[PDB]
Design an enzyme around this catalytic site. Structure first.
Site, PDB file in Angstrom:
ATOM      1  N   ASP A   1      -7.101   1.143  -3.433  1.00 47.32           N
ATOM      2  CA  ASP A   1      -7.676   1.882  -2.323  1.00 47.32           C
ATOM      3  C   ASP A   1      -9.176   1.618  -2.213  1.00 47.32           C
ATOM      4  OD1 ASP A   1      -8.866   3.333  -4.358  1.00 47.32           O
ATOM      5  OD2 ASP A   1      -7.583   5.116  -4.052  1.00 47.32           O
TER       6      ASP A   1
ATOM      7  N   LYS B   1       0.823  -1.204   0.000  1.00 45.99           N
ATOM      8  CA  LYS B   1       0.000   0.000   0.000  1.00 45.99           C
ATOM      9  C   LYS B   1       0.862   1.261   0.000  1.00 45.99           C
ATOM     10  CE  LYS B   1      -3.776   2.576   0.959  1.00 45.99           C
ATOM     11  NZ  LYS B   1      -4.917   2.827   0.053  1.00 45.99           N
TER      12      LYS B   1
HETATM   13 NA    NA Z   1      -1.094   2.183  -3.616  1.00 44.57          NA
END
Ligand code: NA
Ligand SMILES: [Cl-]
Ligand code: NA
Length: 242
Positions: free
Chosen positions: A177, A145
């Site tokens: 996301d 992430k």
């Molecule tokens: Na990302």
């Protein structure tokens, strides 16, 4: 209908993704604003650092990037780590997980110090190399992430400071996301990166450009600023994604 989606995305194309990036996307607008208030190299370094702490926010992404841009406009940044040590605990939109976030910035400080104007130019011409430099400086998976997001945001920042546009590589996947995952669940049971890579390959539009098309529209951005032919394509896409 992945085939219909790919058709409309392909009609929008790189030119349409670029129009949305440069005229509609509020994160790009925030970056352009900051670029007028700080030197180009510091600007790019700050954009990468900011991207790598852009998770588990206490606000929406648009609000957070505007807060970042307003905070740094006119500031004399001598250490990006110390700047973030001051900024984050005083922020409106990024108050949580500060120790982890500061540790990420600390890990990339040496990498950021390599970002001279020329090195920025070189990375903009080889964003696949940039992707690995960032991931290896953090010591994390290329797909974890914020890492792909930092390449996306670098591409916005580099476009602004270099005045040239280099499309994102096809091989860099979308960011996964909430907005993209939630949209994808409405469209398919497939995992989002796999679904969107197929659409990218079918359309020829790299995943990060697909993300740029989708993300502002999913946030409710208007399409009336687009020129007429593009506006009609975006209207078709909105039927699918909203
Ligand atoms: Na990302
Ligand atoms: Cl790696
Ligand atoms: Na600048």
């Amino acid at each position: 209908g992945s085939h219909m989606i790919a058709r409309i995305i392909g009609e929008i194309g790189i030119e349409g993704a670029r129009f949305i990036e440069e005229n509609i996307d509020e994160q790009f607008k925030a970056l352009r604003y900051l670029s007028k208030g700080i030197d180009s190299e510091t600007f790019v370094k700050l954009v990468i650092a900011n991207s790598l702490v852009s998770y588990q926010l206490t606000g929406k992404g648009e609000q957070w990037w505007w807060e970042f841009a307003k905070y740094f406009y006119g500031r004399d940044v001598k250490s990006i780590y110390l700047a973030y040590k001051e900024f984050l605990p005083n922020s409106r939109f990024n108050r949580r997980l500060i120790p982890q976030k500061l540790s990420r910035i600390r890990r990339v400080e040496t990498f950021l110090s390599t970002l001279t104007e020329e090195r920025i130019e070189e990375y903009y011409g080889d964003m696949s190399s940039l992707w690995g430099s960032i991931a290896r400086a953090l010591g994390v998976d290329k797909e974890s992430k914020t890492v792909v997001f930092s390449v996306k945001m670098f591409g916005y920042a580099a476009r602004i400071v270099l005045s040239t546009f280099n499309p994102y590589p096809m091989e860099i996947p979308i960011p996964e996301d909430s907005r993209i995952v939630k949209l994808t669940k409405k469209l398919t049971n497939e995992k989002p990166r796999k679904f969107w890579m197929k659409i990218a390959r079918e359309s020829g539009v790299p995943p990060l450009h697909i993300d740029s098309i989708l993300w502002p529209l999913l946030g409710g951005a208007s399409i009336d600023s687009a020129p007429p032919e593009l506006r009609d394509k975006l209207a078709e896409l909105i039927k699918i994604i909203r």
